[PDB]
Amino acid sequence: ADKVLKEKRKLFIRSMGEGTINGLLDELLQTRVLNKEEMEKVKRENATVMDKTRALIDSVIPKGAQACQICITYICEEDSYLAGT
Amino acid sequence: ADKVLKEKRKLFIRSMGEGTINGLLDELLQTRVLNKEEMEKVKRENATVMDKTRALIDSVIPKGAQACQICITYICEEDSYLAGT
Amino acid sequence: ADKVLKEKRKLFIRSMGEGTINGLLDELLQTRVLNKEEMEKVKRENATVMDKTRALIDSVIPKGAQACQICITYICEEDSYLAGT
Amino acid sequence: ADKVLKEKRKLFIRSMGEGTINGLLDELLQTRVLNKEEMEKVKRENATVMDKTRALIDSVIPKGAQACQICITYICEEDSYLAGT
Amino acid sequence: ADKVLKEKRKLFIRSMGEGTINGLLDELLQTRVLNKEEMEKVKRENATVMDKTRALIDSVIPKGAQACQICITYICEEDSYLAGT
Amino acid sequence: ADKVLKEKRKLFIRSMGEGTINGLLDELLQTRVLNKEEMEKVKRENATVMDKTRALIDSVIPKGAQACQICITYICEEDSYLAGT
Amino acid sequence: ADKVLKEKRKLFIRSMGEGTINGLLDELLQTRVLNKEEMEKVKRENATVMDKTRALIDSVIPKGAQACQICITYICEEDSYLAGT
Amino acid sequence: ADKVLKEKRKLFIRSMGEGTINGLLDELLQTRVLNKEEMEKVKRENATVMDKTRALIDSVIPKGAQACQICITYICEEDSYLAGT
């Protein structure tokens, strides 16, 4: 699916929070999906850390969306009560 | 390939972002590809820093495209999940 | 009504804010009304994110105003205390 | 249809904007319809980037209007809410 | 008075700013004094948005100066500390 | 004195800060000197909120400088240790 | 020296920045060297505020270069580590 | 060496942080290298305070690079485990 899951859809990002996103991010670092520099840049995000979900969408790089398969496997263990899984 | 990679093609520049471009630019400075003055000039770019990818295309100087081999080696380590590499 | 609601009128855009506009925009993305690229371009807007209401007016495309019926249904659930609805 | 769509008509160019035109232009570059030099020349346009729609009309070259079939296929995916399509 | 207020005089346009002009313009749109197209054209103005006061003078159309009675009523509520009112 | 106090002079604006400016602004709103819209626009200011003192100078409208008599009475109670008062 | 310092020379304007230029400008206002209107016009400058050094050169008016003696005294206190002083 | 240390090189600025930069800045104030006004302006920097290292590079004024000898002596006591020293 990859970015195809923008029809999943990203209107439910409202349910995500830093309690698990931070771990996601840590994995994206481990898996060298995102650079530490640009990792830190997420911290620029307006209002709640949650908006950062907008930044996560962005980080579904159009040419790198297959890396979000890593994110999916994180999601799998992340939250068994999350809508969409 | 050099500028030949305009057939690579530059319709996928939509996947790039400042998270790595800034580093690219820093390297172009280090490698004296672009002058600090004109480096700063990138900051003129309309809307998202990303449009700056249009400026990066421009900075594939028709007579200096071989300098983008430096950019390629950056790309190599830049993002292993990027389309086209 | 569509764009006809410019006589609704857009002098009351002064009451809108990013707290709900951001969601509107997200829906315009979901509904493929506006492209992600040009979505990001809204971020160019002078002063308060609110001026962005000027950009929303613009995005009532003269040939695409029927897409703002989607915006109306958003408005319906958006704010039951909003003037004009 | 090609240039025949001047009876489509170009009085509705008022609905176009840089949010999608820029992409169109990028495709005209990719498809080698317009030269990069003359591509840059679009930037001369008076007032709003939008007037550039006047320049787009011009770039419906009388002997090259069939290239605007490429533009049509862009339009198809460009905006499903655009008048005339 | 209408255009007669060029003897009011337009040497005090130096006191105007976009903080209220933008609203004026929005009203000229609402009141269909100026077309949206030519409204956008104001954005061509050299240097500070303020020079736009030169454009406002121009938009005191010689045959349409009575429309500036609308502008006067705007001025009335616009700024109670403005010279000339 | 009004704007005459530009010879007071505005080289000492370096001593002002948001700790009291915000209150000034709130009073300018109360006294309907500045519109809420353009009030919000102050938030556009480069770097420190303090540069906003440049914007305050601007808001000494050439035809509305007598409104800064209100600002003076604010200054009076604002800071008894401020240079110039 | 006055404008004679164009042989000083203005190839080192590359070392100037808004951090001190803004103050210079403020002094040129205080000293009524440049009008507030044309002061604001500096804001038209392409790319980095720094290019504004090109505008500063221009503002070394051929018949008013002695006013830059004021600029020199500013420079004196401006930056004790600046080349040329 | 002075600015010559841009070949040192500024690709390792990635290792710096506010924990010591703030102190550096405080010293630049003490040593009157940078003005308090423009000192505050560093606070404009995008994302992490760290990007501010880009601003530090800028503050290696082309005509004032010898002031960074002060920065070097700071570096000496700053961090004995820092690459390049």
G84 contacts in chain H (CB < 8 Å): 63
**How many Å apart are CA F60 and CA F2, to the nearest integer?**
8
Overall size of chain F counted in residues? 85
Cβ(E50)–Cβ(E40) under 8 Å? no
The token duo for F51 is: 């540069």
What sign does the dihedral F40-F44-F46-F47 (CA atoms) show? positive
Tell me which of C48, C49, C53 to substitute to probe the interface with F (most F C-beta atoms closer than 10 Å). C48
CA–CA gap between residue D28 and residue G45 (Å, rounded)? 31
Interface test with chain G among E48, E49, E53, by most G beta carbons within 10 Å: E48
Tell me the one-letter amino acid at A76: C
- CB within 8 A of D18, min separation 6: which ones? C38, C41, D49, D50, D52
Q: Quick check: H47 contacting A, CB < 8 Å?
A: yes
d(CA F72, CA F59): 14
Q: How far is the C-alpha of H21 from the C-alpha of B55, rounded, in Å?
A: 32
Query: Residues F26, F35: contact at Cβ < 8 Å?
Result: no
Chain-centroid distance, C-alpha H7: 15
Please say whether the beta carbons of H36 and H28 come within 8 A: no
Q: Does G45 touch chain F (CB under 8 A)?
A: no
How many whole angstroms separate alpha carbon A37 and alpha carbon H16?
Answer: 12
| Contact list, E47 vs chain G (CB under 8 Å) | 40-41, 43-44
Biggest alpha carbon–alpha carbon distance for chain H: 32
Q: Which amino acid is at F77?
A: E
Angstroms from H45 CA to nearest CA on chain B: 13
Backbone angles phi, psi at A77, to 5 degrees: -95, -20
Distance between CA atoms of B23 and B39, rounded to whole angstroms? 12
Give Cα C76 to chain centroid, integer Å: 13
Fill in the DSSP letter of residue G46. Answer: S
C46: which chain B residues are within 8 Å (Cβ-Cβ)?
none
Amino acid making up residue D81: Y
Residues 6+ apart with CB under 8 A from B8: B1, B84
- Count of alpha carbons within 13 Å of A79, Cβ hemisphere only? 14
The half-sphere exposure of D62 on its side-chain side, counting CA atoms within 13 A, is 0
Residue with tokens 């205080």: G30
Chain E interface disruption, residue of G35, G38, G39, G41, most E CBs within 10 A? G41
What is the end-to-end Cα distance of chain A in Å, rounded?
Answer: 14
* Contact indicator for G76, G12 with CB cutoff of 8 Å: no
Q: Note the resolution in Å, 1 decimal.
A: 4.8
Task: Give the whole-angstrom CA distance, residue H63 versus residue H38.
Answer: 17
What are the distances in angstroms from CA B24 to CA B4, B19, B29? 19, 10, 9
Q: How many CB atoms within 10 Å of residue B11?
A: 13
Q: How many Cβ atoms sit within 10 Å of the Cβ of residue H78?
A: 19
Cross-chain CB nearest to B14 (options A35, A37, A62): A62
Amino acid at B50: M
Helix axis angle, G68-78 relative to G18-30, nearest 10°?
140
d(C-alpha B21, C-alpha B54), whole Å: 12
Burial letters H36-69, b for 16+ CB under 10 A, else e: ebbbbbbeeeebbbbbbbebbebbbbbbbbebbe
H21 neighbors H34 (Cβ within 8 angstroms): no
Residue F61's Cβ-side half-sphere holds a number of Cα atoms within 13 Å equal to 23
SS3 content of chain D, % helix, strand, coil (to 5): 70, 0, 30
Cα–Cα separations (whole angstroms), residue F69 to E81, F5, F21:
11, 11, 15
- How many Cα atoms are found within 13 Å in the side-chain-facing hemisphere of F34? 25
Q: Are C32 and D80 in contact (CB under 8 A)?
A: yes
Residue indicated by tokens 């106090």: F5
Size of interface A-B (CB pairs under 8 A): 38
Name the helix (H) or strand (E) containing H32: none
Experimental technique behind these coordinates: cryo-EM
Q: Is E9 exposed, middle or buried (0-12, 13-18, 19+ CB in 10 A)?
A: exposed
If you count DSSP H runs as helices and E runs as strands, how many of each does chain G have, helices first? 4, 0
| Alpha-carbon gap, residue H38 to H33, rounded angstroms | 10
CB E37 within 8 A of CB D15: no
Q: What share of chain F is helix, strand, coil (3-state, %, to 5)?
A: 70, 0, 30
In chain C, which residues have their Cβ closer than 8 Å to the Cβ of A7? 30
Give SS3 for C85.
Answer: coil
Exposed/middle/buried for E70, CB within 10 Å: 0-12, 13-18, 19+? middle
Rounded distance, CA E40 to CA C58, Å?
Answer: 10
Closest CA to F56 of F30, F22, F8: F22
Which residues of chain F are within 8 Å of residue G29 when distances are taken between CB atoms?
A: 10
Identity of the amino acid at C7: E
Most distant CA pair in chain C, distance:
32
CATH 1.10.533.10 at C2-78, yes or no = yes
Q: CA dihedral defined by D35, D36, D41, D47, rounded to 10 degrees?
A: 110
Chains F and H touch (3+ CB pairs under 8 A): yes
Quickly count: other Cβ atoms within 10 Å of residue E17's Cβ: 19
The amino acid present at C67, given as its one-letter code, is A
**Residue with the two structure tokens 């507030």:** G36
Q: Which chain E residues are closer than 8 Å to G44 by Cβ?
A: 46-48
Cα(D25)–Cα(B3) distance, rounded to whole angstroms? 19
Q: How far apart are CA H29 and CA H35, in angstroms?
A: 7
Per DSSP, G51 falls in state: G
Long-range contacts, D6-11 (Cβ 8 Å, 24+): D6/D57, D6/D60, D8/D84, D10/D53, D10/D57
Cα Rg, chain D, nearest whole Å: 12
G-chain residue closest to F54, CA distance: G26
Taking the CA of residue H59 and the nearest CA in chain A, the distance in Å comes to: 21
Phi, psi of H66 (to 5 degrees): -65, -15
Distances (CA, A) of A67 to A11, A27, A74, E17, E54: 21, 11, 11, 49, 54
Which tokens sit at E44?
């061509």
Structure tokens at E2: 């209408």
Q: Angle C38-B37-H71 (CA atoms, 0-180°, nearest 5)?
A: 115
Within 13 Å, how many C-alpha atoms sit on residue E20's CB side? 22
One-character DSSP codes across D36-54 = HHHHHGGGG-SSSGGGHHH
Q: Which amino acid is it at G55?
A: A
At A22 the three-state DSSP class reads helix
From chain F residues 1-30, the ones with a CB under 8 A of any chain C CB are none
C43·B48 Cβ contact <8 A: yes
Please state, in angstroms and rounded to a whole number, the distance separating the CA atoms of residues B79 and F73: 60
Q: Which two tokens stand for residue F36?
A: 């809420």
Residues C64 and D20: their CA atoms lie apart, in Å, by 13
- Distance in Å from the first CA to the final CA of chain F: 14
Residues 6+ apart with CB under 8 A from G74: G23, G24, G27
